[PDB]
């Protein structure tokens, strides 16, 4: 769960390193295709809540501060219109 | 590892069989040296990460004069 209240700093660093190896060994448009399919959004809603929008802000700034950006542009426009 | 000698010259067909190195006393499990030497790609990646982190540590030591 991408929640800054509950997850540890080690958990955030772990998720950052895991997603960095994902973005290295396979492409980022392919990663967005793997991450934006509707079937795994019941399993992505822990990662992508789009609710309690300071956690959405944490997810946006986390996937930007890893070095990616991009993956939370949908969360960025969610934060814009909500 | 053993595979097809017909398709070994043309293609790459994976591993189908196994042959022993030499006849040793049953199980043995005598450890191979490649499982103690680190791979080159991991060595280069960890080298670049460690040297960049050392550069930031040296920059912080200069900046704080610590």
């Amino acid at each position: 769960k991408l929640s800054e209240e509950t997850t540890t700093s080690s958990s955030r660093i772990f998720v950052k390193i895991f997603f960095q190896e994902l973005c290295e060994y396979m492409g980022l448009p392919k990663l967005n295709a793997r991450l934006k399919d509707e079937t795994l959004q019941p399993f992505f809603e822990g990662l992508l809540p789009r609710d309690n929008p300071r956690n959405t802000r944490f997810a946006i700034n986390f996937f930007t501060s890893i070095g990616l950006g991009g993956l939370t542009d949908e969360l960025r426009e969610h934060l814009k219109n909500t | 590892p053993q595979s097809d000698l017909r398709w070994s010259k043309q293609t790459d067909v994976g591993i189908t069989h196994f042959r022993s190195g030499m006849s040793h006393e049953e199980d043995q499990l005598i450890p191979n040296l490649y499982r103690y030497i680190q791979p080159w790609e991991s060595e280069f990646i960890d080298s670049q990460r460690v040297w960049a982190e050392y550069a930031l540590k040296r920059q912080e030591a200069i900046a704080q004069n610590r």
Binding site: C23, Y25 | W40
Partner: protein
């Protein structure tokens, strides 16, 4: 590359792009035949000089050239 990337036993360098930080190619790695020729000739030198060399020193020569 057809299909997808190749999950390989460390003898293929997945080649990371400098810009996108993504693997864009694969570098299959093998050993030159003259390297095995020179290594076999080094073992042949070891057995050549083995006629007047103790067992511990033979093991040292083997282990030194091997590592």
């Amino acid at each position: 590359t057809s299909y997808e990337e190749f999950t390989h036993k460390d003898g293929v360098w997945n080649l990371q792009n400098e810009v996108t930080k993504e693997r864009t190619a694969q570098c299959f790695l093998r050993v030159d035949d003259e390297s095995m020729q020179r290594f076999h000739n080094r073992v042949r030198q070891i057995l050549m000089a083995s006629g007047s060399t103790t067992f511990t020193k033979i093991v040292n020569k083997w282990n030194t050239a091997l590592i």
